[PDB]
Design a protein around this ligand. Structure first.
Ligand SMILES: Cc1cc2nc3c(=O)[nH]c(=O)nc-3n(C[C@H](O)[C@H](O)[C@H](O)COP(=O)(O)OP(=O)(O)OC[C@H]3O[C@@H](n4cnc5c(N)ncnc54)[C@H](O)[C@@H]3O)c2cc1C
Ligand SMILES: C[C@]12C=CC(=O)C=C1CC[C@@H]1[C@@H]2CC[C@]2(C)C(=O)CC[C@@H]12
Ligand code: NA
Length: 558
């Protein structure tokens, strides 16, 4: 009895907690189990963005058929069409469900373009959605167990912002000053709270998402067991195995839990399991290069494959160029700052090989593609001058105008030299190649055309360029000492492949037969996006949308 529920959800990422709230609202008894001491997983440390074509809040026109054209073009037949149809059907319904039934609120990023402007059915903004700032005081004592935002996602490492509120500051648009004042203002004047916590009471981005979903579970009294890792599946049947529960380790020993209706695997990927990386991912591969929290070690993937579940796309990760920070367990991803004018990426021959403004997935893939030719692109090198340094952030580096060079970071987070030849030698890059790449950059910046990789050639690239810089907001000269290098690792925000599912998130065996009772969502599952990333929110949109469809399918089963 007391270890029996209709639905057991493994993991407390956004997909898992959404599925839990939805299953509850459809009249099912739910338990959530979380491996770690914190709820929210990678979701909590993310931008919290979801990619929702044809959402109700768009300021421009969109349609199911345009969104399907775009997804068919982006996924290149790797994904069952009925899963693409199901995503486009349910993604808007999942966000309307959040907005009508939770304190958490999503709204569109109106100016945030889809990542593939060259594909048919692309939109110039509005499909990407993000959370309103969320009031952590509504969590009471459960605030203590939230996986906390990386301090880089906060203003002066203190004040929570939305991507909308932020973007103004990174692009250097007019009014950014009042925003800084409004944000840090709110924080310091938050007095009853300032006295019990140095954390902003207001959470943004993935922290708003994870706080808001935790709050939804609290209102519904859905139990969430922390420090309670999944270990294995319970099955019945001689001929076709059905999943009837799980074994967890709870208060330090094994406990058998029964799921009458279904088990939802939302435990994330295997990015933190070096053996699984070496088994499946391209070499060289290193878990240390990941931007994720510590735990996604493929625990549910192994257990499901043990009972006949099929896996796909296991050779793909959600790549991001990433930066080692001393003392920090995760590397910092470079999501936006590469689009800024005056920085170039080179291999060990000092040659460019990628549009520096490339979406991060394609950037990672291009590092592996050039590494196979050159032998020196994983890691690769980011180069910029003292004007870039003064003006712009770059992962853990804040603009030099507000933060001077840290001695403890020299040769660890950045290399610095009075000359380009001097810098090249410190980082093992061909000086003549790097000089050639800088000379070409300076020519490109003059007439605003990158003749090799077309940096700034579309509205996605220019979104994170500098508004003030013309003709191309992504291109500026490199010529004012000192010169800086940063080591760009082939990082990730999770693995992309996983258990094969159908349109209702049911796990499929090697014969495409559903494993009765077993669902799988998020990076635990093979990506509905194939080898692509359609726009900001292309991992969390799918996690939450298939979580919604899983709960719906379980309830519709009676
Ligand atoms: C800085 C950053 C920004 C990002 N921004 C975005 C963005 O805005 N939008 C977007 O779409 N993607 C974004 N991503 C990627 C995104 O965060 C992930 O792809 C997504 O969170 C994966 O969700 P998930 O639910 O599969 O896993 P997670 O969110 O990581 O949740 C999995 C949970 O399962 C738990 N777990 C693991 N093993 C077990 C076990 N054995 N038993 C029980 N629990 C277990 C984990 O501890 C964890 O809490 C970002 C990533 C980072 C690092
Ligand atoms: C690019 C990104 C990541 C993956 C994804 O798919 C969706 C987003 C959108 C929000 C940004 C986030 C990364 C972190 C950013 C740059 C911030 O610190 C402020 C806005 C965030
Ligand atoms: Na934390």
């Amino acid at each position: 009895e007391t270890n029996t529920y209709d639905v057991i959800v493994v993991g407390s990422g956004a997909g898992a907690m959404l599925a839990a709230a939805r299953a509850h609202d459809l009249g099912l008894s739910v338990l959530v189990v979380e491996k770690s001491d914190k709820y929210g997983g990678t979701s909590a440390v993310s931008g919290g963005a979801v990619w929702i074509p044809n959402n109700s809040q768009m300021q421009i026109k969109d349609s199911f058929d345009e969104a399907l054209t775009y997804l068919k073009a982006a996924t290149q037949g790797l994904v069952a069409e009925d899963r693409l149809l199901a995503y486009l059907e349910s993604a808007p319904q999942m966000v309307e469900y959040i907005n009508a039934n939770m304190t958490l609120q999503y709204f569109p990023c109106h100016r945030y373009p889809d990542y593939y402007q060259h594909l048919p059915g692309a939109k110039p903004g509005g499909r990407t959605m993000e959370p309103m700032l969320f009031d952590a005081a509504l969590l009471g004592d459960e605030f203590a167990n939230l996986r906390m935002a990386y301090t880089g996602t906060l203003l002066m490492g203190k004040a929570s912002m939305t991507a909308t509120e932020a973007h103004v500051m990174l692009a250097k648009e007019p009014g950014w000053m009042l925003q800084v004042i409004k944000s840090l203002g709110r924080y310091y004047l938050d007095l009853p709270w300032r006295l019990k916590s140095r954390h902003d009471r207001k959470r943004g981005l993935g922290n708003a998402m994870a706080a808001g979903l935790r709050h939804a579970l609290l209102e519904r009294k859905v139990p969430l067991w922390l420090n309670t890792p999944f270990e294995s599946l319970i099955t019945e049947g001689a001929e076709n195995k059905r999943v009837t529960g799980i074994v967890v380790k709870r208060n330090g020993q094994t406990l058998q839990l029964t799921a009458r209706r279904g088990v939802v695997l939302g435990a994330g990927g295997f990015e933190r399991n070096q053996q699984m990386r070496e088994q499946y991912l391209p070499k060289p591969t290193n878990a240390a290069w990941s931007a994720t929290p510590p735990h996604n070690t493929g625990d549910t993937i192994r257990a499901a494959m043990d009972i006949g579940a099929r896996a796909e796309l296991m050779d793909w990760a959600w790549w991001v160029p990433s930066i080692h920070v001393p003392g920090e367990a995760a590397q910092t991803g470079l999501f936006a700052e590469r689009n800024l004018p005056g920085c170039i990426v080179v291999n060990g021959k000092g040659q460019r090989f990628i549009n520096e403004a490339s979406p991060y997935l394609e950037f990672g893939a291009a590092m592996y593609e050039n590494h196979a030719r050159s032998g020196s692109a994983v890691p690769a090198w980011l180069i910029f001058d003292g004007k870039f340094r003064y003006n712009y952030p770059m992962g853990p580096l804040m603009p030099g105008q507000i933060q001077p060079d840290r001695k403890a970071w020299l040769g660890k987070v950045y290399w610095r030299d009075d000359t380009l030849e001097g810098l090249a030698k410190q980082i093992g890059v061909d000086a003549a190649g790097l000089k050639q790449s800088v000379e070409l950059n300076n020519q490109y910046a003059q007439d605003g055309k990158d003749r090799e990789f077309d940096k700034g050639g579309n509205v996605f690239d220019r979104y994170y360029g500098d508004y003030n810089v013309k003709p191309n907001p992504c291109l500026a000269p490199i010529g004012k000492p000192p010169y800086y290098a940063m080591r760009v690792d082939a990082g990730d925000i999770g693995t992309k492949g996983g258990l094969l599912t159908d349109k209702d998130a049911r796990v499929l065996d090697e014969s495409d037969r559903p494993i009765e009772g077993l669902y799988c969502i998020g990076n635990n599952s093979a990506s509905v996006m194939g080898k692509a990333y359609p726009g900001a929110g292309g991992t969390l949109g799918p996690a939450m949308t298939f979580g919604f469809r899983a709960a719906n399918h379980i309830a519709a089963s009676k």
